[PDB]
Subunit: 329 residues, 4 copies
């Protein structure tokens, strides 16, 4: 990586060569774009899946849904000019990028993404069947060429991932993940910006300090592409398995949501699904408590409000008439 | 940080904010002038440790040898001002930075560094009792402040280390280490640029893919501050315990020494100590073979000549009239 | 700010911190998420303004129209739940963003609404009623611009992003005719200057003199450019500003071109514009002493469909001024036809 | 200028083309390669000026003084090679870069800079006769080409300065000036970094808000290359014509120097020359009083001490036994 960067304290310009790990979620200008391989190959793969009995596909990344939406008309043209009665419908991403149990091999209605339905579940939908072939060119926005995978795997594509550590600051980056960490008497996670919630597994070749990791202590659960590292850990908290993951984009941070107070009281209820501060009628709950936390509290900053972690419980409301996370069990 | 990665061939510019790992080994332009916390505190430390049986100290990094050489005169002046009979001589480090067995807890001739002697063995010498507390400012020189450690540990200081991975390239950087990994159908080490040979342990908080690692497969042994990971690995080889580590400055790369050939055969003996291509007489050995290595063979590039790994043994020349590795087997 | 630039013609990367002014030619965003002060405060202000005789509002920029189109449904829901006979209709922008002569003063004793923020509630389109509160749209007679509010909001905090951008607005303390400065900029370095904005990008350069070079307008505002964000703002004559101050042209001497005066009756009725200096295809412009005086700006192609090729000028300087719109080519206020009168031609709809 | 930049959050990555105003005062550049017209032309112009009656020159900027010091030896050599009895002597600047009343037209001692004496009256020296032609680079070979002016001008050269404003932060930049302004309920100056004190005039083509400006309200006077702007203003202060401008390198900031307090009260003496906090002996005065200023007070942070503005007078000690500004009233 030829080039160099200035420090965060104004002017400490170190210049040389090495490996650069750069934030991608917090950008105004798009920096990466997905490009398919050929309209002819994708149409043949879709027809082969239709013969096999595949209803549709489930996008793995929010940058892949755009790529699938951008070629729907061309796929429809190719399918129509073949004597085949088939229609490809491009949906939109809403909630968790759920995983299917099917894949697409290299060469009615075919529904792509879309809201979860019962006519054809994710049981027979194709998921995680693209691999990065190489990187293209472009002054500011570089494009990425995709290819069909050889087989099937639950591990995310490792050609789009990063991980770095320097002095007392680590990071586990991705195209839609940015998980930070720091050291203050302990190595623990401090913030995590997510523009999506995927499901494939984080590979262990791109993780820092991935030994002795206990699966029940990972703040971002392994089922939601959380790194299998000890930097993915916060003291006093366990895995947030029933958090507000249905929101889609999240902003994990440590602090207090505006207008509320959290106190450590042993006379508190056990862990349960994450609750929103504002009631469904707009009323705010301003008194919360938790058993054995570590201040400051853990909050998720979604689009519809500020949530709390799985261990913090209210003291003002009965929790019967409060909106909770939609993650089932 | 904040900076850009450029590609002069073509047009590319990847800017943003994140973590940037820069090659600090290939600098050849600056020497940091270390400044301890208190000259009176240090003199008290050596004076207190003198009666405890500590004959001297041994450096852990090639940078603190410089500060000891710089401040030995001021230490002697302070000792003279204190009206005490003690003399301190700052020697030079040549070869492996040996490991002591004592420590200077905070409050004849006291030998700092230098060659091993029977009257002052390293088993009565202190080792690894300073740590970096803060960083300085400046381009010509940076003031690195060092303070006494609270406890005693065999792990190297983590405030100077870093590690990164992106796409298909990894690196385990340091102030005197530069290990690079790359993926070609498998992750394996490809080159290393060591300007020193330490003895402390690489921290597991700064390693990538440190799960399921066997000590009998690390190309750079953990006794010489080799990262405890699976990127530090090469197919067909094992731990290079008896390699040419006494040279000090090293250069690990895979290839052929000029005018030599290595062939796959079952007619050679087992692995042994590292050997030079050129003999004590001055001639050059051309016929080499390995039992189960992989081409290109492991090659060490020191000041004296071009060495081989432990698994490459000569086929024509006799091992009894050539120089072996001075490290104990 | 922090960041740095590359010079392809050669090798150099000067990298540091300062103030960086960048255009919007490489940036795109999908969704805006506006957030005015409160659903109950804004609805109360609108109701009071309607009771005072203000029968509508008129947008001051192009983001304001998007905001109103987005929040109209919740405004209607609040007004219906309050049991008041009033419906809000949000229209489009066609041409110049005209200016009204009223304002919404901050209310007292606002309406009753449980939520304190926009969009985080379930609503529905209640009904239509006999009284309307028009927001923008085509100009009519029942709501002239004299009884329409204008320029009564200003942003306070904002955040941009690739997928979602957030902007917070608030009521203005008083009434003013000056555009909001919290999203515009201006810079100069060496022999190049720029007067940027969210919809304006004016470039000036030096070649023996300082004069305007090219301007790209995606909107035609009407508020004044603040003088705190203006370079070389001393000794400027209002009759020499190429982009008149009535259309948010900076009160600068960089906003100037030799041989031309203010273009009052230019083709501003188009909205999107691209001012540049050159010759439109298939036409030739000369300088003569017997040409006609300046008048309404004209188009190269007549209404029938055929173009004219002989144009002349009296006192301008080559290359001629040129307006590039969706309709076609429009010459400057000084270039006049020679081989065909302006009669068989379409002229600027701006009133003269 | 094509490039990409972030904001003061680390977010909102915008890549594109525009105008980039970058801090050049705090650049830590140590190598400069100035290229004047020609050794044959400068010597001829100097000889003609000396024949006309000029006895020396006065540098307009620090870089010009560096250039003259670098090229003085070659100028002397080329002047001697032609058989002319003249020697060029290059000195160093101390304080304000004073201005001369002559110029060099295109084609026994000749002093450059240095102290002030009767050998060369300040009205018999050349000043502001060179202008920039081409620009330099960005790693270590910044090469600026100079060229003779056509006529005599007292305005600073515009090829090297800039100015920018964005939201609520402005800046007036140069190679030796860095003046910052901000909006906190009103537009007023915030801080200024001055590594030199010039005497030419800031051109009004590179000035923001240069209308309705009253000459007596500019914090940095018009005679010291202060911008003719309304951003160059502080509420409660007037022109600092008799400030500590004789220091040279300076740092204008608002606050209280350590160990002193300022209180606004109606009883106080009128304005006057600026004076240091500490007296000649070394006693630090602790009590000061304004008359109509606004807190925090204006202070100049020089290389010898912390000064105050013309409005902050001392009350606990007479000004007779204190060091005052050396600039003539």
């Amino acid at each position: 990586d030829t080039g160099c960067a200035v420090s965060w304290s104004g002017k400490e310009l170190k210049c040389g060569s090495g490996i650069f790990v750069i934030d991608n979620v917090h950008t105004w200008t798009e920096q990466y774009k997905f490009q398919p391989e050929s309209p002819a190959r994708l149409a043949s793969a879709i027809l082969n899946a239709h013969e096999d009995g595949v209803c549709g596909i489930r996008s793995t990344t929010r940058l892949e849904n755009i790529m699938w939406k951008q070629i729907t008309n061309e796929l429809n043209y190719v399918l129509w000019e073949g004597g085949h009665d088939l229609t490809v419908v491009a949906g939109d991403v809403k909630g968790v990028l759920s995983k299917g149990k099917r894949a697409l091999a290299p060469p009615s209605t075919f529904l792509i993404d879309g809201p979860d339905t019962s006519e054809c579940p994710n049981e027979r939908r194709a998921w995680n069947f693209l691999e990065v072939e190489d990187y293209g060119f472009g002054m500011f926005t570089t494009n990425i060429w995709m290819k069909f995978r050889e087989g099937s795997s639950e591990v995310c594509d490792h050609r789009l991932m990063s991980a770095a550590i320097k002095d007392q600051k680590a990071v586990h980056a991705d195209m839609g993940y940015w998980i930070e960490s720091s050291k203050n008497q302990t190595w623990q996670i401090e913030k995590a910006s997510l523009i999506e919630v995927k499901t494939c597994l984080w590979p262990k070749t791109h993780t820092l300090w991935s030994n002795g990791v206990l699966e029940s202590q990972m703040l971002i659960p392994k089922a939601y592409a959380g790194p299998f590292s000890q930097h993915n850990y916060r003291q006093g908290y366990a895995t947030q398995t029933v958090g507000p993951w249905h929101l889609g984009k999240l902003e994990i941070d440590f602090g207090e949501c505006p207008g509320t107070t959290v106190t450590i009281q042993e006379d508190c209820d056990h862990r349960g699904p994450s609750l929103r501060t504002t009631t469904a009628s707009g009323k705010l709950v301003t008194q919360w408590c938790c058993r054995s936390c570590t201040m400051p509290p853990l909050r998720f900053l979604g689009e519809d409000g500020c949530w709390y972690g799985m261990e913090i419980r209210p003291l003002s409301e009965k929790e019967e008439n409060m909106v909770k996370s939609q993650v089932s069990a």
